[PDB]
Write a protein that binds this ligand. Structure first.
Ligand SMILES: [Mg+2]
Ligand SMILES: [Mg+2]
Ligand SMILES: [Mg+2]
Ligand SMILES: [Mg+2]
Ligand SMILES: [Mg+2]
Ligand SMILES: [Mg+2]
Ligand SMILES: [Mg+2]
Ligand SMILES: [Mg+2]
Ligand SMILES: [Mg+2]
Ligand SMILES: [Mg+2]
Ligand SMILES: [Mg+2]
Ligand SMILES: [Mg+2]
Ligand SMILES: [Mg+2]
Ligand SMILES: [Mg+2]
Ligand SMILES: [Mg+2]
Ligand SMILES: [Mg+2]
Ligand SMILES: [Mg+2]
Ligand SMILES: [Mg+2]
Ligand SMILES: [Mg+2]
Ligand SMILES: [Mg+2]
Ligand SMILES: [Mg+2]
Ligand SMILES: [Mg+2]
Ligand SMILES: [Mg+2]
Ligand SMILES: [Mg+2]
Ligand SMILES: [Mg+2]
Ligand SMILES: [Mg+2]
Ligand SMILES: [Mg+2]
Ligand SMILES: [Mg+2]
Ligand SMILES: [Mg+2]
Ligand SMILES: [Mg+2]
Ligand SMILES: [Mg+2]
Ligand SMILES: [Mg+2]
Ligand SMILES: [Mg+2]
Ligand SMILES: [Mg+2]
Ligand SMILES: [Mg+2]
Ligand SMILES: [Mg+2]
Ligand SMILES: [Mg+2]
Ligand SMILES: [Mg+2]
Ligand SMILES: [Mg+2]
Ligand SMILES: [Mg+2]
Ligand SMILES: [Mg+2]
Ligand SMILES: [Mg+2]
Ligand SMILES: [Mg+2]
Ligand SMILES: [Mg+2]
Ligand SMILES: [Mg+2]
Ligand SMILES: [Mg+2]
Ligand SMILES: [Mg+2]
Ligand SMILES: [Mg+2]
Ligand SMILES: [Mg+2]
Ligand SMILES: [Mg+2]
Ligand SMILES: [Mg+2]
Ligand SMILES: [Mg+2]
Ligand SMILES: [Mg+2]
Ligand SMILES: [Mg+2]
Ligand SMILES: [Mg+2]
Ligand SMILES: [Mg+2]
Ligand SMILES: [Mg+2]
Ligand SMILES: [Mg+2]
Ligand SMILES: [Mg+2]
Ligand SMILES: [Mg+2]
Ligand SMILES: [Mg+2]
Ligand SMILES: [Mg+2]
Ligand SMILES: [Mg+2]
Ligand SMILES: [Mg+2]
Ligand SMILES: [Mg+2]
Ligand SMILES: [Mg+2]
Ligand SMILES: [Mg+2]
Ligand SMILES: [Mg+2]
Ligand SMILES: [Mg+2]
Ligand SMILES: [Mg+2]
Ligand SMILES: [Mg+2]
Ligand SMILES: [Mg+2]
Ligand SMILES: [Mg+2]
Ligand SMILES: [Mg+2]
Ligand SMILES: [Mg+2]
Ligand SMILES: [Mg+2]
Ligand SMILES: [Mg+2]
Ligand SMILES: [Mg+2]
Ligand SMILES: [Mg+2]
Ligand SMILES: [Mg+2]
Ligand SMILES: [Mg+2]
Ligand SMILES: [Mg+2]
Ligand SMILES: [Mg+2]
Ligand SMILES: [Mg+2]
Ligand SMILES: [Mg+2]
Ligand SMILES: [Mg+2]
Ligand SMILES: [Mg+2]
Ligand SMILES: [Mg+2]
Ligand SMILES: [Mg+2]
Ligand SMILES: [Mg+2]
Ligand SMILES: [Mg+2]
Lengths: 190, 144, 93
RNA sequence: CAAGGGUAGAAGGGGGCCUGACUGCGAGGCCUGCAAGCCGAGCAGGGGCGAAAGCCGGGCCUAGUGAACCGGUGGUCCCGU
RNA sequence: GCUUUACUGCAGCCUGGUGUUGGCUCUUGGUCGCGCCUGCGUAGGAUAGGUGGGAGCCUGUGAACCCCCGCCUCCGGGUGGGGGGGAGGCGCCGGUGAAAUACCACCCUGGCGCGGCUGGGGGCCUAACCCUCGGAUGGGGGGACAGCGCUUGGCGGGCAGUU
RNA sequence: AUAGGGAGCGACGCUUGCCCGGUGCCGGAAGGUCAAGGGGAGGGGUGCAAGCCCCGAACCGAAGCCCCGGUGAACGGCGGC
RNA sequence: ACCGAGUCCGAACAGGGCGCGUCCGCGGCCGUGGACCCGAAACCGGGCGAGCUAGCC
RNA sequence: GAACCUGGGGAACUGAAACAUCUCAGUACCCAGAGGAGAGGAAAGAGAAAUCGACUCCCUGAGUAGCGGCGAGCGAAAGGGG
RNA sequence: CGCGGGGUGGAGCAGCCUGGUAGCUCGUCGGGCUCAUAACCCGAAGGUCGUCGGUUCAAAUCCGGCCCCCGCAACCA
């Protein structure tokens, strides 16, 4: 077995919910290990990708044609901290942590897709995909999936999660690669 | 501690088996009492000699005791001892049947082995059995 | 003493006492704080066995113990009969 | 800080920048059985203070120390059966 | 020559591990393949442990009232075994909370029943070994102990060499 | 065991006090420390590799020593102003 | 390592440290051998002694 | 059975200007055995060579390589010539 | 010098065995009150938990730098 059959992940109404779990070093030293949210992924899910990437206020026009259905600007600033937990944004770029009511009061706060104009470009690949998480005081890794619309496309997690790790100092060994959830379980050799 | 058993005993397979034990157990109990022997190639090999010369020497009762059905199975008997209206002549008995179990031809004969519950002493078309491997029920015709 | 089956006998070895921590670690090294002469005897054990008429007994290293039993099978190819615990022994190889 | 020799034409008291309590060397000497101990101009590197001349390779000076061997660390052009 | 809490050994004695060294057991360990457990300040049908997915598992594989009655404690049920037996409940949605209850993956802080790898503590036996008995290829007793081999650490003027 | 070994005292008479801190010896199935051995988290050496070699934490590991207590016809000790 | 009338330390076309017979005889002295000669008290090995003396049978 | 040889055991004085590792020394000596010799002997060798080719004995290598309270002191082998 | 066990009211000093709890005698102060004294009795000052820091609504607890006293195999040219 030099590989792992890309087919067998068959309790749902459309299986594309398969996850990707793991387990390396638990709370190494006094730090740990966190994974970036919307990196890219070799595919791009299929759910309502509301990348509310709250970037410049100039992200309502062209920033809603190749990224997300609704992208915050400057009208959804402190008008989201005084209108209940209804009015999850991300953050901005550069050295100006403008967390007025989207990255301080509690969800995302990564950054803004370096464009400083809008969000419809085509020099990237992480507009409508799957986010991520982090450790867990016991477990780690965390993610979603890639996309269900091909053949051997089930090996998209063996290169975006099972073949892409560079955020750990010194611990011991990252042995797990046991993925697939909300349906089956592919704890094979990933 | 490879050892070949004899009179089989619990915790250890049936006779003539290559079961493992504890050196002490064998040297001070088994061997002494003749309840086993050492798996010395010298015997371990002389065992297969008990096998082939029993397993490959079995095509006789299993593959040849059978020919006592290839010839004397599909061949009528008919009692050459007539009768009354229904109670047969000669009483038709294990003997008056075994006398010519081989006479009819010349390959095998037998007297005791017969599913003959009670002496027929009654006309008819009887067909009982024999033994011990595949049971061979021969066709006997108690004629009148 | 000495094994009848393998000829093993006691040998002279040297009881060497050392002091200090090795070089494999801390440093400086070990120092012989003495060396006495001594002997190491072979693990001789007594082994009684039935074989033939009489039951004879061998004295042998614990290592060469089996060798005596395998030495009894082979015995089965010999004409013993004569009642003599001694001779039967010599008669083994 | 012991005593002594020295010293206000500072080696003493105060302040401002600094780290030469440099690295590589070292003419020539003092002392001396050996090996040790002591002083040192000057050259190169890279500095420090000064406008500069220049001074700085610890401390007014003389005690404040321990050959080798065996090991411990950190490095480095070396040897590596 | 002698002495000792002078140094360093040695004899001797004590001691763990293995060897000679075996049966049958009951009882518990370390822990890796397992099966399910748990956290009860507020929201709360309840006891939600987490990271995240997250809207069907369920149904003649019998989804609801019903009874024997195991478990644990924060006494709520978490939970579960037999028959009548039924054709639908859970939950997204909501209250709410720093996180939300259908579901599945994979983590354990404690825990745990079916079993391997395996170590301890008891018992019993007998056949090694040991002792005995008007000779015994046998019977008593001890018994995997003791003895003896290799190896661990220790006490050690009894003795040795020396300062 | 009214016997056998070791020790001191030494017919007989009257007696033989106090001190278990230290030393010795006796008793302590708890704790602490402790060797080989078991165990292996984790780390290293090479190899294209399977691998083959090494170090190695936690925890389990006796006697002994520490600790608790006893003991003087045991070694000994039995005040000053 | 290696370089070589040079080489080493050094960054250094500064400095400074080191850079030209064999064989036999004979004689003096030195090293290892008792080593100028005689001399211990003692230490170790293998034996010989209880016809003296001590104890016991 | 004078020495000689092989194996099994195996000191101390002394030296280190004390002494214990070390040295003397596998010497002295005890024991067994062999024989006119004894031992060893036809590679599971040597060690760096496109190599050598049983064993033993002599000369060299060599007071070298190394060992060593790196003290006192101990001290090879390959290769080469016989 | 190497593992790894804890510092707390002035002092004696429990939780850390599974994270919100500031535990108690003696001692200090008044009282109750007795023969003096004393057990006792009730109220009570008396612990940023060494602290730069991660962890949380809350951190002495999950735990890193070692700061220090006890324990401290062994080593020591
Ligand atoms: Mg065994
Ligand atoms: Mg010592
Ligand atoms: Mg010696
Ligand atoms: Mg000696
Ligand atoms: Mg063995
Ligand atoms: Mg003056
Ligand atoms: Mg000044
Ligand atoms: Mg000089
Ligand atoms: Mg100068
Ligand atoms: Mg200068
Ligand atoms: Mg000064
Ligand atoms: Mg000074
Ligand atoms: Mg000054
Ligand atoms: Mg020295
Ligand atoms: Mg090299
Ligand atoms: Mg004398
Ligand atoms: Mg003895
Ligand atoms: Mg032992
Ligand atoms: Mg033992
Ligand atoms: Mg018993
Ligand atoms: Mg018995
Ligand atoms: Mg007997
Ligand atoms: Mg008996
Ligand atoms: Mg018994
Ligand atoms: Mg035993
Ligand atoms: Mg010892
Ligand atoms: Mg010992
Ligand atoms: Mg001693
Ligand atoms: Mg003495
Ligand atoms: Mg003495
Ligand atoms: Mg001497
Ligand atoms: Mg001295
Ligand atoms: Mg008595
Ligand atoms: Mg007595
Ligand atoms: Mg007496
Ligand atoms: Mg007296
Ligand atoms: Mg007297
Ligand atoms: Mg009186
Ligand atoms: Mg008295
Ligand atoms: Mg008295
Ligand atoms: Mg008194
Ligand atoms: Mg009194
Ligand atoms: Mg006392
Ligand atoms: Mg006492
Ligand atoms: Mg006491
Ligand atoms: Mg004591
Ligand atoms: Mg005791
Ligand atoms: Mg203990
Ligand atoms: Mg160990
Ligand atoms: Mg070990
Ligand atoms: Mg191991
Ligand atoms: Mg490992
Ligand atoms: Mg103990
Ligand atoms: Mg002590
Ligand atoms: Mg007690
Ligand atoms: Mg007690
Ligand atoms: Mg005491
Ligand atoms: Mg005393
Ligand atoms: Mg020069
Ligand atoms: Mg001279
Ligand atoms: Mg001379
Ligand atoms: Mg001379
Ligand atoms: Mg003299
Ligand atoms: Mg004399
Ligand atoms: Mg002598
Ligand atoms: Mg003698
Ligand atoms: Mg004599
Ligand atoms: Mg006499
Ligand atoms: Mg006499
Ligand atoms: Mg010899
Ligand atoms: Mg000596
Ligand atoms: Mg000397
Ligand atoms: Mg001398
Ligand atoms: Mg002397
Ligand atoms: Mg000597
Ligand atoms: Mg020697
Ligand atoms: Mg020697
Ligand atoms: Mg020898
Ligand atoms: Mg010899
Ligand atoms: Mg001789
Ligand atoms: Mg002879
Ligand atoms: Mg010859
Ligand atoms: Mg020969
Ligand atoms: Mg050959
Ligand atoms: Mg050849
Ligand atoms: Mg050969
Ligand atoms: Mg070589
Ligand atoms: Mg030394
Ligand atoms: Mg030598
Ligand atoms: Mg040669
Ligand atoms: Mg030659």
């Amino acid at each position: 077995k030099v590989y792992t059959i890309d087919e067998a992940a068959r309790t749902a109404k459309f299986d594309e919910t398969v996850e990707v779990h793991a387990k390396l070093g638990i709370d190494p030293r006094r730090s740990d290990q966190n994974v970036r949210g919307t990196v890219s992924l070799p595919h791009g899910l299929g759910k309502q990708v509301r990348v509310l990437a709250i970037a410049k206020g100039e992200k309502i026009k062209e920033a809603e044609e190749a990224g997300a259905d609704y992208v915050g600007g400057e009208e959804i600033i402190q008008k989201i901290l005084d209108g209940w937990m209804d009015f999850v944004m991300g953050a901005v770029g550069s050295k100006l942590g403008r967390i007025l009511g989207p990255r301080g009061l509690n969800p995302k706060a990564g950054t803004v897709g370096f464009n400083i104009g809008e969000i419809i470009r085509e020099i990237k690949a992480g507009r409508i995909e799957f986010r991520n998480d982090k450790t867990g005081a016991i477990h780690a890794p965390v993610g979603k999936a890639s996309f269900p619309p091909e053949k051997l496309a089930d090996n998209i997690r063996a290169f975006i999660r099972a073949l892409e790790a560079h955020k750990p100092e010194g611990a011991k060994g990252t042995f797990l690669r046991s993925v697939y959830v909300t349906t089956t379980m592919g704890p094979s050799v990933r | 501690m490879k050892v070949i058993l004899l009179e089989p005993l619990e915790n250890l397979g049936d006779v003539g088996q290559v079961v493992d034990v504890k050196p002490g157990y064998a040297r001070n109990y088994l061997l002494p009492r003749g309840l086993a022997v050492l798996a010395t190639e010298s015997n371990l090999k002389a065992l297969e000699a008990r096998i082939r010369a029993q397993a490959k020497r079995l095509a006789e009762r299993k593959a040849e005791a059978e020919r006592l059905k290839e010839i004397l199975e599909n061949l009528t008997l008919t009692i050459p001892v007539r009768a009354g209206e229904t109670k047969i002549y000669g009483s038709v008995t294990a003997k008056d049947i075994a006398e010519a179990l081989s006479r009819q031809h010349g390959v095998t004969i037998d007297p005791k082995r017969l599913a003959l519950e009670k002496p027929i002493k009654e006309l008819g078309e009887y067909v009982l059995t024999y033994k011990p491997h595949p049971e061979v029920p021969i066709q006997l015709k108690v004629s009148v | 003493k000495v094994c009848e089956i393998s000829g093993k006998r006691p040998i002279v070895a040297n009881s060497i006492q050392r002091r200090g921590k090795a070089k494999r670690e801390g440093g400086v090294g070990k120092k012989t704080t003495g060396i006495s002469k001594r002997r190491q005897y072979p693990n001789l054990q007594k082994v009684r066995v039935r074989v033939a008429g009489q039951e004879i007994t061998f004295r042998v290293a614990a290592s060469h113990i089996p060798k005596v039993y395998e030495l009894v099978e082979r015995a089965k190819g010999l004409r013993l009969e004569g009642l003599s615990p001694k001779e039967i022994k010599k008669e083994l190889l």
